[PDB]
């Protein structure tokens, strides 16, 4: 039997999204084939999947984003812009886009796509909080709210 | 701008499923370049929707699947495997699953395709409530607990 790892879904055809990985998740993860990951944590990548990737020939994009509680949030534009490029690239898919648990970087980097994809806003935050759900932050989404999509 | 259907999600490549989309979703749907559509209720297809149809070639497969609440619901193993059927074709790709809320119907559908694909309950049981929510119900999961994943 196979276990997708934390809050995984597929976000478009060759985009991939979910929390961070584990063992058990690997044999799922090999089924997607994947070309690249893009990594939203600053913390080092554990021993064991680095094995897998290198096992598995995926290349392991990193822009590390601190991860802080709603009182006070603060989202790196230049990080989730530099993650959004890789993605936008079609030569590095199959991607998966992975943070901690899956929900509030994972969750503006996938904001941000949709935007780009000309969702309306309403239609955005509510894939959203799919993910987030009791834990979505309004700052994410203000912060998708306000993301200058001019490429 | 887009405005994907009500509970809009991508199942895998070439499946899709979300609730009972109206014309502020079409603009949308036009972009999935839908082949097929597959209605899980047993309610007559409105007027607009069936203009869309026609005028996307988007076949319609329908097994209406009547809908009750918690306390006693029942859910038509055969309709689901007749659904199940259609899903398992290529040919019919891309397909979108739909019913009224995109919860429970829907989500049993697209729960035995997972059973299919040899994901464990634990997994596919959290795909189901990510969508179902507040309203994700018992019955449910357990025709996916207890589905014939024999072909």
């Given at each position: 039997?196979?276990?997708?790892?934390?809050?995984?879904?597929?976000?478009?055809?060759?985009?991939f999204?979910?929390?961070?990985?584990?063992?058990?998740?690997?044999?799922?993860?090999?089924?997607?084939?994947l070309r690249?990951?893009?990594?939203?944590?600053?913390?080092?990548?554990?021993?064991?999947n680095?094995?897998?990737?290198?096992?598995?020939?995926?290349?392991?994009?990193?822009?590390?984003?601190?991860?802080?509680?709603?009182?006070?949030?603060?989202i790196?534009?230049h990080?989730?812009?530099?993650?959004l490029k890789?993605?936008?690239?079609?030569?590095?898919?199959?991607?998966?886009?992975?943070?901690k648990?899956?929900?509030?970087?994972?969750?503006?980097?996938?904001?941000?796509?949709?935007?780009?994809?000309?969702?309306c806003?309403?239609?955005?935050?509510?894939?959203?909080q799919?993910?987030?759900?009791?834990?979505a932050?309004?700052?994410?989404?203000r912060?998708?709210?306000?993301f200058?999509?001019?490429?």
């Amino acid at each position: 039997h196979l276990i997708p790892p934390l809050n995984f879904s597929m976000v478009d055809n060759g985009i991939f999204r979910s929390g961070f990985p584990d063992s058990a998740n690997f044999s799922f993860l090999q089924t997607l084939g994947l070309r690249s990951i893009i990594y939203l944590c600053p913390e080092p990548y554990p021993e064991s999947n680095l094995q897998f990737l290198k096992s598995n020939g995926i290349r392991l994009f990193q822009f590390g984003i601190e991860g802080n509680k709603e009182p006070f949030v603060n989202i790196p534009d230049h990080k989730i812009r530099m993650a959004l490029k890789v993605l936008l690239d079609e030569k590095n898919h199959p991607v998966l886009i992975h943070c901690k648990r899956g929900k509030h970087r994972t969750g503006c980097l996938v904001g941000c796509l949709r935007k780009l994809q000309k969702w309306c806003l309403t239609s955005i935050f509510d894939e959203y909080q799919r993910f987030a759900a009791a834990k979505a932050r309004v700052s994410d989404q203000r912060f998708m709210e306000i993301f200058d999509v001019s490429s």
